[PDB]
């Protein structure tokens, strides 16, 4: 019965996470920022400095 | 992010500005008088109520806007009196009353003066400011010849990266003279002089790889 | 659709953009009434309109 | 009074903004491009589409900005879009959907009712394409005046021929010529012996001014 | 001491001028119609509405405009709505609906309280719609005899055929039309052989009026 | 645009009629005397201080508004000298002190809008009349083509100034035939073949450039 689909009375809720290891190195160190090579702007849309 | 003299005879600056209370601007307020120009001095714009006296107003943008004040200036006027104002009060920007806290903050920047320094690179005391041309140590010029200039400035702008000889001599001395390893030791003892020791630290050597920049703390 | 594509007679033509009919759209909306009354305009111009109206 | 320009692929000025059509200033539109400084005339005021676009906007206010003399140039945005608004767009004003019809009228005449500078011992005069230093009579023509011009311009600013052929000259590029060396030699020379060190040579990669003093 | 008389559809002459109360001046009051300018009696002068809009507010404006004798018109618009506000309403004098009483009277004290040039060798009689040129008869069509007075008080202006369209027409306007060529080149024609030298006619630049001698 | 004259007891436009300030229109002072009349010249207005002297000021309308002086007559007065304001003024027009910009625009373009020529321009002998599209230059009309008038006169307001022959393309010929723009250089010929050599160099030449215009001295 597609109620229970619209309802979501059966539906999960389903984590994730992805783990993001910057590491030290001779080329340097992974610097997370916005500073992001050859990026287009609805890219940036939803991301934060 | 603002200190700013807001010029009224009413006590608060929320019948001026409701939306102003919602930003970190802070908020000195100053009877509508001629007086409040001398209690200027380090306010970063000067906010001139002109909602309902548009005749002294005037006078008070006209004031603020004088021989040697550059403070910069905002009449905040009515919608049925914007026409009355223009470049005339010695402005560059107003403020409506129904200016939004988001709108306050881009006119306050916009009327301020964003202005980012151009390729001003900086490395510890040595701050390099390509365009000149010059890789000043705190304030003094510093003299290179062409290519160290182009050497440091490229591992300035790559410091911490532990480069190589035959790396560096491709991005420096071109394509080209590509033997002869041991100009960069020349080069780089000059460097090393020309700097000064004070701040050899920015330079690193690793044996058997090369040279280096480190960012001091 | 603008009228300039009617092709009618150059009177016609001008006739009908002299009292600001710019589109077929307004010409056609203007009832067979609304057309005759157009100062100094001729009937042969209203037939030709009148055809591409019903054709075109 | 004015004509105002939307550079908008709206085709029309009221989804665009609501209130210019209750003021009588009369705008036509063009779509989103640079080029359409081709288009404008005798208008006053040309305003840049940004509401949807924004960084769209802010790269054709860069290209439409303050060269000369400067026409009055706007762009519109949102609300939450006035993050990026910054004074490197190269605005006198900026403009939101929620501008009034007498707000957008007091800014218009804000930006209409300034002077170019040109000193450095040096007269400069943008429209007279004339020159002046240490004495009235400094011949400047064509060529070496806004050459002269664009390094006082740019004091500092170590400038080389590949940077002056695409500013100087138009250009072809016809470039790798030698003519500046010529043409600063002749604005080494013409300049007398005073002033001769405000343009000097930085090897490798051309010339700046060195500023007075 | 004057009867100003309001055509406005506000129903109250408060809103339209506030401080007219204040000026023991009596108001009659009707809606913005062409008919109740038969409605004026011994009324001194007459304001119109066009705070709003300004384009039916001049319309009316120039629809008294011209009919002679006449009474003079005046207009109330806003501060922003003062770039349509010019000579070519046929207004005798503007307000502003922020006009003070003492400054209405000063207005209205002065606007309620000769011969044509001679002469370029052609006459205008405003009666028959004809003109005189070194002789008594000079028959003029409708817009053969206008077309003359355009060219006769703008004697040396520079015309092109459109400038010459939109007010020697009424205009609508149609193309294609070589009018100014039928009725210049008649209008060079009923002149005689005298006075063909007083339009100038050179290529492309339109029809303008060479004055003597 | 419009030029203005302000006789006044005061030294600057500000404080007499302080909204034509807010305009860019250009105002000159003078005395509020007679001799005064004679600085008005090739004026659009002239507008006299009588907010103070009213029996003065109105014999200086007087005197500006006697049989031949076709500049249209003004002053300027308080709202307490309204009342003096009447036909015996002989004025064209009234403005208060108190009168926004655009409504002095208005104000402006209903008393003026002598016949003050729009686009009458005169370069030495090029007298450039286009409101009658002809130039005199040394007296003698320029009987120029139809297409070169404009090109004479586009180098002549643009007096000194150098433009490439596509600069040149934008402003004669616009957007049409961009390609091939000898033919300026032919219509210099045509614009010589009816100057001479008394103007001959007025038009100066640019080798590999273009031309330019000479100011005569």
Known sequence: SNRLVEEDVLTSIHIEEHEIDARDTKLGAEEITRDIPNISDEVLADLDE | ?217 | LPIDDLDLTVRSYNCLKREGVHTVGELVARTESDLLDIRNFGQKSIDEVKIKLHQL
Not at chain 2, 84 to 103: H, Q, R
Request: glycine residues 10%; proline residues 5%.
């Open chain 2, 1 to 217: 992010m603002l200190e700013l003299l807001l010029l009224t005879s009413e006590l608060y600056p929320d019948p001026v500005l409701p939306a102003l209370s919602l930003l970190p601007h802070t908020v000195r307020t100053a009877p509508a008088e001629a007086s409040s120009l001398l209690e200027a001095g380090n306010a970063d714009a000067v906010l001139v109520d002109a909602r309902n006296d548009l005749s002294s107003g005037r006078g008070l943008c006209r004031l603020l806007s004088s021989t040697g004040r550059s403070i910069p200036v905002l009449a905040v006027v009515s919608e049925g009196g914007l026409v009355a104002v223009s470049a005339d009060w010695g402005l560059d920007e107003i403020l409506l009353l129904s200016t939004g806290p988001a709108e306050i903050d881009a006119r306050l920047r916009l009327v301020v003066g964003d202005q980012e320094s151009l390729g001003k690179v900086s490395l510890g005391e040595l701050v390099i400011d390509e365009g000149t041309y010059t890789a000043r140590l705190r304030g003094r010029p510093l003299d290179l010849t062409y290519k160290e200039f182009e050497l440091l400035k490229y591992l300035a702008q790559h410091a911490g990266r532990v480069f190589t000889r035959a790396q560096l001599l491709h991005e420096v001395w071109g394509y080209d003279f590509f033997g002869g390893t041991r100009t960069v030791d020349v080069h780089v003892r000059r460097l090393r002089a020309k700097l000064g020791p004070e701040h050899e630290a920015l330079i690193g050597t690793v044996r058997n790889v090369g040279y280096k920049a480190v960012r001091p703390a």
